Write a protein that binds this ligand. Structure first.
Ligand code: PGD
Ligand code: PGD
Ligand code: 6MO
Length: 765
């Protein structure tokens, strides 16, 4: 095979060059306006040293099963087995747990970003097999907008975080002031959940070309700041709600806010105002009070409030500030401030929670929806409570107004996810995993999660199979044929093939496949989309002509004029919101009735577990544990891209020159970052891009424990979740709080370390 083949991924559409059956280059689609340099690593992930070659069973589990010593999971002592042996064992273990403990004994939430593709949807496929086996405990929500997706339905009556934004071209013609509040769109627009079109890049360029005023509110001087030469505000992390309250307070005290908008489109501002004015707690939430907490000068807070009230302003917020203790307060207070400014539903004004994610704002086409394989259908937990569940079987927990009991789980099955990187408080989690009798993982790269499994099955990538998928989570630019580029490597198999074999052994083979093969499933999804298109007046070709061209693109009709909340603004009685009042709920009677101490019935400033310069806080530096520039989470850490950012081989840590100098740390030194939960190594990069008092260690580094049998073992590489706490945002959402982290840093003076996470375990070589 010598030629080229087009396909797609979370990073975009591309064409691969193939030479004697090997992919040798991935070249960006010629219509991609701003491709990601991460494509190089996506191609490298098919072949790197951490590619999973064969099915493996952890030696202890292979010998003793349920009586295994579980304290050694992750030490790398695996045994290679055949596919028939491994498939029989997995089917036997699913059957035994289902039969002994019921569906409540199997956890199949398998949270994860996997790969796009309507057929090869590993996590849906997992749940299709588990439903056929008798059922499972699922997870609810995500780590992404854990709090925001739960509080928004109560405030604005919709999900809001994953819904279309006022279109980019509408902003270029009407916005005078664009605010990126805890958002770094240049960084986070490189990927999509479905294939990305990178629509934010022309949208950002158009704002810059129009000369629109841009303000960034973030502890780090990011590439979004640099792109625009933006006015940059640097709040101490976790204090954005105080800043917003000081802005709101200024708008009332100077008599500037939109009283008519508040009276006509909102409910409960009259119960929020006494709090804001300090009538209930003797503490007026003034700009000065906000400076005391956040460090942002009081006069700067008042001038921004003034500026925002006097100009058509769009508040484009990102999600780091809701991935923290009391995370629900951030976007609730943001909507409350935007309601006082009175521009919601006006062209170019209001707020948007998705301008930094998967092309939100890219004009939607008139094309049809594309759907794929389905799963064939307490039993559900908030996703981030998985370790609490394992440690407290039968215990009660609160979630969004209802109380339930944790199921008693004995097996976990994970595919397309990396919990030994994404979950908070690694040391606690490692100990809690000993409650599981059996842990099964599918991946194509030797992540920490695969290293810690009892049974490891090698999955294929999307580049070794055929699939179909939309281009554009919001734009619906078109539909792509994700064509097979190379044959499956080593003994890797698709998740579909693996679960069909397991289901077959359970006597449910035919039900799992539904009588179809790979192209029979794909053609069925295509034809359904084509039927809907024909009925909508969007004619598409027949499946074989579509597949030969490789893509179908759809036309934009009125999508470039979309203004979010315009129909509500234009007539709120005719087009009410989905809340109990039909209005924006600044005070929520439904939340009040829950009686949750950590989620009051209006936006409130509350002390988090720990914050930079908080009264009595133990550790001195905040860790901006944010999304990586050159990975998708942990994805691509085991590729050639790593050498472009590693420092002495470790994950990098940005540190301000003043904080480095106080510890005698030089640029490029190996340093230990530690607190009461754990300790890791990173390689420092000294730079004033991070504000003083803050260090930046991205999430996604592959945890590489020095000795898994040692409690509190040093991580040799730099997984920042060895340092996070595992607590819920509050009882409302129970979201993860992965960015509520303080720690100390010192030049490292312990034993030298050898990195073992970027080569396969010896027996799997
Ligand atoms: N401290 C902290 N700060 C944060 O900001 C933070 N972010 C959180 C958020 S928002 C999220 S969304 C999570 C993400 O955590 P998530 O577990 O989703 O991270 P990924 O590195 O995308 O894991 C995806 C895995 O799927 C594998 N994979 C891809 N395709 C396939 C396939 O077809 N088959 C199989 N079997 N495997 C496949 C990949 O190789 C990869 O190992 O991390 C969360 N964790 C976080 N912690
Ligand atoms: N390149 C890339 N890699 C990814 O892993 C990736 N993940 C995707 C996912 S699953 C999601 S959920 C989104 C994440 O989108 P999200 O907006 O949650 O991204 P983060 O990088 O966690 O934070 C964005 C900015 O918040 C700033 N920040 C941190 N703490 C604070 C604070 O207290 N206050 C303020 N004002 N700013 C703060 C950080 O400095 C960072 O620049 O990105 C998506 N896009 C992604 N792109
Ligand atoms: Mo996310």
């Amino acid at each position: 095979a010598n030629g080229t083949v087009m396909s797609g991924s979370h990073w975009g559409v591309f064409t691969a060059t193939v030479e004697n059956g090997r992919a040798t280059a991935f070249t960006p689609w010629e219509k991609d306006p701003h491709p990601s340099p991460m494509l190089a690593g996506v191609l490298d992930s098919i072949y790197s040293p951490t590619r999973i070659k064969y099915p493996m069973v952890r030696r202890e589990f292979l010998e003793k099963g349920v009586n295994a010593d579980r304290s050694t999971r992750g030490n790398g002592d695996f045994v290679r087995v055949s596919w028939d042996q491994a498939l029989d064992l997995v089917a036997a273990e699913v059957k035994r747990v289902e039969e002994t403990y019921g569906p409540e004994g199997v956890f199949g939430g398998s949270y994860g970003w996997k790969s796009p593709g309507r057929l090869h949807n590993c996590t849906t496929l997992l749940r299709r097999m588990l439903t056929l086996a008798g059922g499972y405990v699922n997870g609810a929500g995500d780590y992404s907008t854990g709090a925001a997706q739960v509080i928004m339905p109560h405030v604005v009556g919709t999900l809001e975080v994953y819904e279309q934004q006022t279109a980019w071209p509408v902003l270029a013609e009407n916005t005078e002031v664009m605010v990126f509040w805890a958002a770094d769109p240049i960084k986070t627009s490189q990927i999509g959940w479905v294939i990305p079109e990178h629509g934010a890049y022309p949208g950002l360029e158009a704002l810059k070309a129009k000369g629109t005023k841009v303000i960034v509110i973030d502890p780090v001087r990011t590439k979004t700041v640099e792109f625009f030469g933006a006015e940059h505000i640097t709040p101490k992390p976790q204090t954005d709600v105080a800043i917003m309250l000081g802005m709101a307070h200024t708008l009332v005290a100077e008599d500037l806010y939109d009283k008519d908008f508040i009276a006509n489109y909102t409910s409960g501002f009259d119960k929020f105002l006494p709090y804001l004015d300090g009538e209930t707690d003797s503490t007026p939430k003034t700009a000065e009070w906000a400076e005391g907490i956040s460090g942002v000068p009081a006069e700067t807070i008042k001038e921004l409030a003034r500026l925002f009230e006097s100009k058509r302003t769009m508040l484009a917020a990102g999600w780091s500030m809701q991935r923290m203790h009391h995370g629900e307060q951030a976007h609730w207070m943001l909507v409350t401030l935007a309601s006082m400014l009175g521009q919601i539903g006006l062209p170019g004004g209001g707020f948007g929670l998705s301008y930094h994610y998967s092309g939100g704002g890219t004009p939607s086409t008139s094309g049809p929806a594309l759907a794929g394989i389905t799963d064939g259908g307490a039993s559900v937990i908030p996703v981030a409570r998985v370790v609490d569940m394992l440690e407290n079987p039968g215990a009660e927990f609160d979630f969004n107004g209802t109380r339930s009991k944790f199921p008693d789980v004995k097996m976990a099955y994970w595919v397309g996810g990396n919990p030994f990187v994404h979950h908070q408080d690694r040391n606690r989690m490692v100990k809690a995993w000993e409650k599981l009798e059996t842990f099964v993982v599918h991946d194509f790269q030797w992540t920490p999660t695969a290293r810690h499994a009892d049974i490891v099955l090698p999955a294929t990538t999307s580049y070794e199979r055929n699939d179909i998928e939309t281009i554009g989570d919001y734009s619906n630019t078109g539909i792509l044929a994700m064509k097979k580029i190379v044959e499956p490597l080593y003994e890797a198999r698709s998740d579909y093939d693996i679960f069909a074999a397991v289901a077959e052994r359970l006597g449910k083979g035919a039900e799992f496949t539904e009588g179809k093969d790979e192209m029979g499933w794909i053609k069925s999804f295509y034809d359904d989309a084509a039927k809907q298109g024909k009925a909508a007046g969007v004619q598409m070709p027949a499946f074989d002509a579509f597949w030969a061209e490789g893509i179908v693109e759809f036309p934009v009709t009125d999508g470039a004029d979309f203004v979010r909340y315009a129909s509500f603004r234009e007539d709120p009685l005719l087009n009410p919101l989905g809340t109990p009042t039909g209005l924006i709920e600044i005070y929520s009677k439904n939340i009040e009735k829950m009686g949750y101490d950590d989620c009051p019935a209006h936006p409130t400033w509350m002390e988090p577990l720990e914050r930079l310069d908080g009264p009595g806080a133990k550790y001195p530096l905040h860790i901006a544990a944010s999304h990586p520039f050159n990975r998708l989470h942990s994805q691509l850490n085991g590729t050639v891209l790593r050498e472009g950012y590693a420092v002495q081989g470790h994950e990098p840590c940005l540190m301000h020159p003043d904080d480095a100098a106080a510890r005698g740390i030089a640029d490029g030194d190996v340093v230990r970052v530690h607190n009461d939960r754990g300790q890791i190594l990173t390689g420092v990069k000294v730079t004033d891009a991070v504000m003083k008092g803050v260090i930046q260690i991205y999430e996604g580094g592959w945890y590489d424990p020095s000795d898994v049998t040692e409690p509190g073992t040093l991580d040799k590489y730099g997984d920042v979740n060895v340092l996070s706490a595992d607590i819920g945002t509050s009882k409302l959402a129970q979201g993860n709080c992965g960015q509520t982290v303080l720690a100390e840093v010192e030049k490292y003076t312990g034993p030298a370390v050898t990195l073992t996470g970027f080569v396969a375990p010896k027996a799997a070589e």
